[PDB]
Amino acid sequence: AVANLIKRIEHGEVSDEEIRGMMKIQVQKRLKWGYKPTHEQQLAQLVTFAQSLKGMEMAEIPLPFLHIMCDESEVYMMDLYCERAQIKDGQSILDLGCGHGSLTLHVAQKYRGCKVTGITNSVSQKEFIMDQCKKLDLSNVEIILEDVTKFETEITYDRIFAVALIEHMKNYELFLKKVSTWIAQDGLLFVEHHCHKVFAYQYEPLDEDDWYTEYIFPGTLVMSSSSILLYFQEDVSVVNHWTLSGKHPSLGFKQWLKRLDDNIDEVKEIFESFYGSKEKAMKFITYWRVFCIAHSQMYSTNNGEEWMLSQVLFKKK
Amino acid sequence: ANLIKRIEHGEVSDEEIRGMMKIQVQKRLKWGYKPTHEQQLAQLVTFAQSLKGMEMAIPLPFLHIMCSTTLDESEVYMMDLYCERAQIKDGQSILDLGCGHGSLTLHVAQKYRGCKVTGITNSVSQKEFIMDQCKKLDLSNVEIILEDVTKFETEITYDRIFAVALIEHMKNYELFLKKVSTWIAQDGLLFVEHHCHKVFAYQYEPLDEDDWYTEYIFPSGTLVMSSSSILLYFQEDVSVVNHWTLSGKHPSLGFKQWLKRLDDNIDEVKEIFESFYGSKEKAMKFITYWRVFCIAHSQMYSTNNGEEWMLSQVLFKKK
C-alpha cells in the first residue's frame, strides 16, 4: 500500500530534491536489473524481448495551457530532424502524431513548397496548429484528426516523420509494416525514440518499494533500446542511425518544468476551469512535475550515457 | 622489418610474441573505444557505409594431420550448435559456402542422410580432401563445386545455406548478401558466423610505426574485422531471424589447441612443407606465420575474459 507517499508529494511535503533522491535509487535498481555479466547474455535478452513485441498489439488538454507552454534548443533539434531526414523543398510530408505541431509548423514555414500533412490524436492540438497556421498565413498544412494505428490512405509521401510516437507502440513490426505502405518511391521514414543505450524493458515494478512505475505508468508500455529497431527491418531498411546523449532530454524536462513553475498560478487556474475542481487540477500538476523531475534525473545518469535518444532513417523494402 | 626475419629463425620466443600482441591489442582498443555512445555509433555506421563502396573480396598430408575439451570434441560441439541454430532437418538441400576442409559439409551430410549437401571451394586440394573422405565414409549426398564464391553464379536455390569463416575474407557485405539471397529457397534460411570485435569494426591498417603485426599477418587484401552488430546494417536483401554471440574464450581455446597439434607434430609438418615448397627456409617461413597467427589470436580473443573479440552468429531469412 505504497499509495500514501503520493499526496505527501502532492501537498508538497516531499521536496523536488527528495524526489530526485528517490529516482536515483530507482535508476540504480533498473540498471542492475538490465545489465548482464556477458555480451552473450545481454544480446540474448534483447533478441528475446524483441521477439516478445511481435506477440503484442501494435499499441494500446486545454488550449490556454498550450498557449502558456510551447526554446531554441527546440529549434536546433528540429533543424537537425530536417537535415537528417534529407528534407527538400517540394516534397510531400507526413507527420505522424504531430502533437503541438511543433515539427509540422517548423517544416511548413522553412519549406514553403512542401505539402505537410499532420496526423493527431486530439481536438485541442489540431486546433492549436491550424490556428498557428492562420497567424503565419500558412496554406502549407493539413491536419487529419485520427488514430495513427487505424489510419490508412492511397496516398504516399516522400518523407514521413515519426517523432515521440514509438514510445506509445509495442509491436514495432506491425507499426513499421503499416507505415511502410505510405512511403513513396525513393521516400524516407525518420524515427526518433527515447531508449536505454543497451537494454529494453516493459514498465513493470522492480520490487515493492517501487512507486515510480505504477505512479508514472499506470498499463503496459515499453522502453526501447537504441539498437532494437535494427531487428525490425522486414518492411523497411536502415539508411542511417544516430544517437544523442541523455543530457539533451534531461535539459528538455528541466526547461519544461521551469516554464510550468514560472507560470504555475495561471496553470492552476486553467485546470480548475477545465476539470471543475482544485483537487484534480492539483493532481494533473503534481503528476507532470514529478514526471519532469524524475525523467530529468533518469536521462542525466552517468553524464547521459544510459538513457538517451535514438534516431533512425529508413527507406522502403 | 628485420623483426620478422628474426622470428622465423626462432630467436623470438612464444612469450615475447604474446607480449607484443598484448601491446597491439591495448592500442587497438584505445583506438576503437569512444568517450560517448554518439561517437561510438557514428564510427560504426560510417564504417559500414564505406564497406558498401568496396569490392566483395595446402598439402593433403598437413590436412590429414590437423583434422579442457579436445580439438576434435569442441569442433563437433560447434557443428552441432550450427545445425541446431540453422534449423537443419533431414531432407533439406544444403549449400556450404567456403566449405574449406569440408568439415561442416561432411558433418551435415553424415548426420542427415536424406539431405543433399553442396559445398563450394576455390581449391585444387581441399576438394578431394573432402571427396576422399566421401568415398571412405561411403557418402553419396555430397557434391563439391570448385569455384570462387565471389564469382560463383547459380540458378539453384537451397533450403539452408551456411557461411562460416567466410565473412572474415569479405569487405562489401552488401554485395555478398545480395548475391547469396538469390540462392535462398522459398522459406529457406542463411546462417552466418563471423569473428568480430564486440563494439567497433576496422580495416587492418597499422596503428603506428611500431605496428609489425598488421603488415606481417595481413600483408594486404585490405581486410576487415567486423563488429558483432555490423550485419544488422546489411538487411536490404535478407532479414534477421536471430542473433547470438559466443565469447572470445571459444576461439582463443581453438587457436591454442591448433598450435598444440601443429607443435606436437612439427617434424612431419616441416617434412611435408619443405618438400612441398622446394625450400627449407621457405617452409620455416610458412610454419612461423601460422604459429604466430595462433599465438597472437589466442591472446587477442582471450582479452578481458573473452569480452572484447568474440564470435557473432546471425540467422537470416529472405526479404
Curated annotation (Swiss-Prot), chain A:
Family matches, as CDD domains: AdoMet_MTases
UniProt activity-regulation remark: In the presence of a racemic mixture of tetrahydropapaverine (THP), one molecule of (S)-THP binds in a productive mode, while one molecule of (R)-THP is bound next to it in a non-productive mode. The (R)-THP seems to inhibit the release of products from the enzyme when higher concentrations of the racemic substrate are added to the reaction.
Pathways per UniProt: Alkaloid biosynthesis
Keyword terms of this UniProt record: Cytoplasm, Methyltransferase, S-adenosyl-L-methionine, Transferase
Superkingdom of the organism of origin: Eukaryota
Family to which the UniProt record says this protein belongs: Belongs to the CFA/CMAS family.
UniProt key word Chloroplast: no
Main location: cytoplasm
Induction: Not induced by elicitor treatment.
Catalytic activity: (+-)-pavine + S-adenosyl-L-methionine = N-methylpavine + S-adenosyl-L-homocysteine + H(+); (S)-reticuline + S-adenosyl-L-methionine = (S)-tembetarine + S-adenosyl-L-homocysteine + H(+); (S)-stylopine + S-adenosyl-L-methionine = (S)-cis-N-methylstylopine + S-adenosyl-L-homocysteine; (S)-scoulerine + S-adenosyl-L-methionine = (S)-cis-N-methylscoulerine + S-adenosyl-L-homocysteine
PANTHER family documented for this protein: PTHR43832, S-ADENOSYL-L-METHIONINE-DEPENDENT METHYLTRANSFERASES SUPERFAMILY PROTEIN
Chain positions recorded as (S)-tetrahydropapaverine binding sites: 167
One GO term of the biological process aspect: methylation
EC nos: 2.1.1.300
Any Pfam family: CMAS
GO MF, any single term: methyltransferase activity
Subunit structure: Homodimer.
Cited SUPFAM superfamilies: S-adenosyl-L-methionine-dependent methyltransferases
GO CC terms in record: cytoplasm
Positions of S-adenosyl-L-methionine binding: 97, 121, 125, 147-148, 163
Protein name according to UniProt: Pavine N-methyltransferase
Cellular compartments annotated: Cytoplasm
